[PDB]
């Protein structure tokens, strides 16, 4: 999308303690409901 | 709301930080020459990538 | 000892782990 | 007075405190249903007691 | 830009200092009786000396 490594490496790591390792989906319960990564929904469009 | 006494800025002025977007919002321009949208416009909320 | 309170699995009483006495549930901890 | 450069709030923002009157002044409503006056109006300077 | 919710001054108010020019800019008057220019006017940037 347009979210930055300037932010994503210091935000997804703030919840999950990973990011200095490889980026990977944490587990099915470290992403709680009112947590970060379950709601991250990037997308795109093609305007003329 | 409706000042009518034109003494202006009685309010504490905080420094403008150093990036593009807190200085003006006039009709800017990209580095080759097409105009870029002002910061008032809601056009500049998605990454326009040519 | 307080051995007359634990639900004994057999003769040995069921004595839990040491993390079963406190908690540290903060937002991001 | 006559900004013309639409970069807005260069001024230090203090928190809004917790009561009714510093959040909006739209046409509110009392608990049974008649509308209450906005805070802009000078009607709300005396205790209207039914 | 276009408030539309008339709760006003959420901004931190700094004291007005003690001189003429930060209190109002209405059509003032000199000590004998001719009117002096308001502070909005650019007339009051040179020392008018009679």
Residue A34 neighbours by CB under 8 Å, 6+ apart: none
Residues of B contacting chain A (CB within 8 angstroms): 46-47
Resolution at which this structure was determined, Å: 4.0
Against chain C, the chains showing at least 3 CB pairs within 8 Å are none
| D2 in contact with chain E, both atoms CB, cutoff 8 A | no
Dihedral angle at the C-alpha atoms of B41, A42, A5, A39, nearest 10 degrees? 110
Bridge partners (DSSP) of residue B29 are B35
Using the Cβ of D27 and the Cβ atoms of chain E, whether some distance falls under 8 Å is answered with no
Residues of E in contact with B1 (CB under 8 A): 3, 6, 8
Q: Count Cβ atoms below 10 Å from residue D39 Cβ, excluding itself.
A: 19
User: CB distance D11–B12 less than 8 Å?
Assistant: yes
User: Nearest Cα to E7, choosing from D31, D17, D29?
Assistant: D17
Strand ranges, E, within chain B = none
Nearest CA in chain E to D7: E1
Please give the backbone phi and psi of residue A4, each rounded to the nearest 5 degrees, phi first. -100, 150
Report the sign of the C-alpha dihedral through residues B20, B21, B26, B32, in that order.
positive
Q: CB of B39 within 8 Å of any CB in chain D?
A: yes
> What is the C-alpha to C-alpha distance for residues D13 and D8, in angstroms, rounded to an integer?
12
Q: What is the nearest CA distance from B23 to chain A, expressed in angstroms?
A: 23
Residue B12 and residue D11 in contact, taking contact as beta carbons nearer than 8 Å: yes
B38 to chain D, any CB pair closer than 8 A? The answer is yes
Neighbours of B39 (CB within 10 A): 19
Q: How was this structure determined?
A: cryo-EM
Query: In this structure, what are the phi and psi dihedrals at residue C12, rounded to the nearest 5 degrees?
Result: -80, 130
The answer for residues whose C-beta is within 8 angstroms of residue C8's C-beta and 6 or more apart is C14
**Who's near B20: CB < 8 A, 6+ residues apart?**
none
Give dist(CA A12, CA A18) in Å, integer.
7
User: In E26-44, which positions are buried (b, 16+ CB within 10 angstroms) versus exposed (e)?
Assistant: eeeeeeeeeeeeebeeeee
**CB-based contact, D42 to chain E, within 8 Å:** no
Q: Please give the DSSP secondary-structure letter assigned to residue E27.
A: -
Other Cβ atoms closer than 10 A to E25: 19
Among B47, D5, B17, A43, smallest CA distance to B36 is for B47
The span from the first CA to the last CA of chain A, in angstroms, equals: 19
Helix (H), strand (E) at residue A12: helix A5-16
What residue has token string 């470290």?
A30
């Amino acid at each position: 999308c347009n979210m930055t490594k300037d932010w994503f490496l210091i935000q997804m790591l703030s919840h999950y303690n990973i990011g200095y390792q490889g980026f990977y989906v944490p587990e099915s319960y470290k992403d709680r409901m009112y947590s970060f990564f379950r709601n991250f929904q990037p997308m795109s469009r093609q305007v003329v | 709301v409706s000042f009518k006494g034109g003494v202006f800025s009685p309010y504490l002025t905080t420094r403008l930080p150093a990036w593009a977007g807190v200085r003006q919002n006039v009709m800017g321009s990209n580095v080759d020459g097409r105009p870029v949208a002002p910061a008032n416009s809601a056009t500049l909320t998605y990454a326009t990538v040519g | 000892n307080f051995a007359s309170l634990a639900p004994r699995h057999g003769s040995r009483p069921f004595m839990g782990t040491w993390n079963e006495i406190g908690t540290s549930q903060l937002n991001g901890g």
